[PDB]
Design a protein around this ligand. Structure first.
Ligand SMILES: [Cl-]
Length: 164
């Protein structure tokens, strides 16, 4: 198990423009295109991201390429983020994945807002952090995914992703 398989399970794979859980135009493996309600704006963003006239549809190779770029960016983002880097650096390799997962889904800014949870993770107070992370819009809106990520932070193992 690794970050790519983890996110592939949480985000799925779709080759045509779709709306994510919040209603935003997305494609591939959770690649957000735009928050604008315009499917045209979305189609424009897609072509620009892929470098060709896609008309709203891409190939698996293209999907995997975007996914790779996105994970890469997420990690680099964490590493240059003042509030996130120290936490990331304090964690083991499995837990690094749970943090990347959150950033991939909500963005740096979103994650940087979990101040108290972050301090608890830094202090390695696993159960306390898990309870705190659950007190959030994130948990209430996407509970199954949040439960998987939280369990990952709590246990430091891939159990929540086993049998999926
Ligand atoms: Cl969910």
């Amino acid at each position: 198990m690794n970050i790519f398989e983890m996110l592939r399970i949480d985000e799925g794979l779709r080759l045509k423009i779709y709306k994510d859980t919040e209603g935003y135009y997305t494609i591939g493996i959770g690649h957000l295109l735009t928050k604008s309600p315009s499917l045209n704006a979305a189609k424009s963003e897609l072509d620009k991201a892929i470098g060709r006239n896609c008309n709203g549809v891409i190939t698996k190779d293209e999907a995997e390429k975007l996914f790779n770029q996105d994970v890469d960016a997420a990690v680099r983002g964490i590493l240059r983020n003042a509030k996130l880097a120290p936490v990331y650096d304090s964690l083991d390799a499995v837990r690094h994945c749970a943090l990347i997962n959150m950033v991939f889904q909500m963005g740096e800014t979103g994650v940087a807002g979990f101040t108290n949870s972050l301090r608890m993770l830094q202090q390695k107070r696993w159960d306390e952090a898990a309870v705190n992370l659950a007190k959030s819009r994130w948990y209430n809106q996407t509970p199954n995914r949040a439960k998987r990520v939280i369990t990952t932070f709590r246990t430091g193992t891939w159990d929540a992703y086993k049998n999926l």
